[PDB]
Amino acid sequence: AVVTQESALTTSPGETVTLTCRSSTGAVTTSNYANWVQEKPDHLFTGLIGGTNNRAPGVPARFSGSLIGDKAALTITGAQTEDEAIYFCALWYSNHLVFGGGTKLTVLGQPKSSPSVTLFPPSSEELETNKATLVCTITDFYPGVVTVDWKVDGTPVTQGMETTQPSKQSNNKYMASSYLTLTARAWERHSSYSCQVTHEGHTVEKSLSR
Amino acid sequence: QLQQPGAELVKPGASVKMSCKASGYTFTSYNMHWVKQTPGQGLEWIGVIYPGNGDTSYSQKFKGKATLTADKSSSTAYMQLSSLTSEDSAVYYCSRGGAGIMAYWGQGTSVTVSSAKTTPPSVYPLAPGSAAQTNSMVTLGCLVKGYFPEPVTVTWNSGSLSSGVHTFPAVLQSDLYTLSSSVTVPSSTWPSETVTCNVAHPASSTKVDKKIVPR
Ligand SMILES: [Mg+2]
C-alpha cells in the first residue's frame, strides 16, 4: 500500500499547522501506530510521535498526533521558527512499515528574501580543456524553494544542466548553485548565456556574452 | 544511544556491513529498525529486529538484500547489505522502536557505491568578466571540478576573507564531484587588492592556490 502526505505547507510563528497522512487504501486506524519523524539539515532525524498520538521522550508539547477523517494528523500548535523542516509519517501494516513522501514545512521566521544571483563564464583555463562550465550561484533567498532556468542565445536549454538542492545558510536564508556544462566548441557556437532564477513568483536573471 | 559510522565507500558488486551502537538504555528491551534514504524513493523501510529474542522482519525489496543482526553483548546492532549496486548508494539509518514509537535515530551511514579512484580536482578562478554587473560589491569564486572522493575545503586568502563566503554542495558529474565557493568583497578591494581561493583535497593530498584575476 502507498502512504500519502502533502508536498509542502507554509505557516507563521505562533500559528497552528496540521499535516495529514493517507493510507492510499485509507482507513488509517490505531492499528498502524502512525509515526511522525522530523528531518532537519544534515540528515538529523528526530522521532516526534508514535503509536498515533504518543509523544516521543523529550519532544515539545506543541506537537501532537491524532486521526482526522480517514487520515492520520500531526498538529503543531504555536509553531516555532525551528520547526521549519521536513516531516515524514510512517504506517505499520502488521508485518511491515511504509513511509509517506514527507512534507516540507516552512515557518516564516524572517522576511521574504530575494535571491542574489551571480553568473560566472567559463575560465580561460578550463576552456583549454575543451570544456566549459558556467556557474550560477544563488544566495540569500527565503523561503527555500527556487527554480532555475538556463537560456542560450535566448532559448531554453535543459541539457547539460545541474542544480543543487537548496541548502540553508548561517543567517537562515537559503543557497543553491546551478551548472551548465558544454564543450568549448559548443561554448563558442553561441554568444549569449543566461541563468534565470524564479522565487515566489518573481524572476531574476543574470546574463553574459561570450 | 545511536552511533553509526558516517560513510562507507564500496565498489560495485561488493558487500558492506555497518553498525549502530546503542547507549543510554537496555539494548535488549527495544526494537531496532533500519531505513534507507534516497531522493528518488524518499525513506524506505528495510526491516526490524528485536535483539531480546533475535527475531527479524524484512521488507520485500530487502529480505534478500540485507541481514539484520544484533550483539546483545556490545549493545550493537548491525546491517549487512550484499551485492551492492549504484542503486544502493544512499543514507542508512537505524532507529530504536518501543511501544510503537521510533523515538531515537542514528545520524545515518552514507554508503557510496562507486568504482572511481582517488582523483584530485582542477581549480578554476571565477571572475565577473563578460556582461557581469558593475555595482558596489563584487562576487568572486572558484570551481573545484572533478575530484573524488568528497570532501574538499576552500578558504579565501588563507582565511583572512571570512565574511561573505559561501561554499555550495557538490554535484556528481559521472562519478566525480564538483563544487564551487564564492566570496563577496568591496568593489574597491578588487582587483585592487589580491583575492585568492585556497583549495585542499585531503584524500589526495592535493593543495592549490588560485588567484582571481580580471577576465
Ligand atoms: Mg512489539
Numbering used by the authors:
A (entry chain L): 2 to 211
B (entry chain H): 3 to 105, 107 to 218
The publication says:
Two antibodies, 13G10 and 14H7, were found to bind the porphyrin hapten with nanomolar affinities and enhance its peroxidase activity. The anti-porphyrin antibodies 13G10 and 14H7, with a λ-light chain, were shown to possess shallow hapten binding pockets compared with the other structurally characterized catalytic antibodies.
The crystal structures of Fab 13G10 and Fab 14H7 were determined at 2.05 Å and 2.55 Å, respectively. Fab 13G10 crystallized with one molecule in the asymmetric unit, whereas the crystals of Fab 14H7 contained eight Fab molecules in the asymmetric unit and were pseudomerohedrally twinned. The hapten-binding pocket of 13G10 is a shallow cleft, roughly 12.7 Å by 7.2 Å wide and 8 Å deep, at the upper part of the VL/VH interface. Electron density could be observed for a magnesium ion and two molecules of glycerol in the combining site of Fab 13G10. The magnesium ion likely indicates the position of the Fe(ToCPP) iron in the hapten/antibody complex, thus confirming the location of the catalytic pocket at the antibody combining site at the VL/VH interface. In the most stable 13G10/Fe(ToCPP) predicted complex, the hydrophobic CDRH3 loop stacks against the most buried carboxyphenyl group of the porphyrin hapten and must therefore have been specifically selected by the immune system. In the calculated complex, the metal of the porphyrin is located close to the magnesium atom that has been characterized in the X-ray structure. A strong interaction between one of the porphyrin carboxylates and both AsnH33 and HisH35 of CDRH1 is always present and appears as the most important feature in the recognition of the cofactors by 13G10. Indeed, the deeper cavity observed in the structure of 13G10 compared with 14H7 comes mainly from the different conformations of CDRH3.
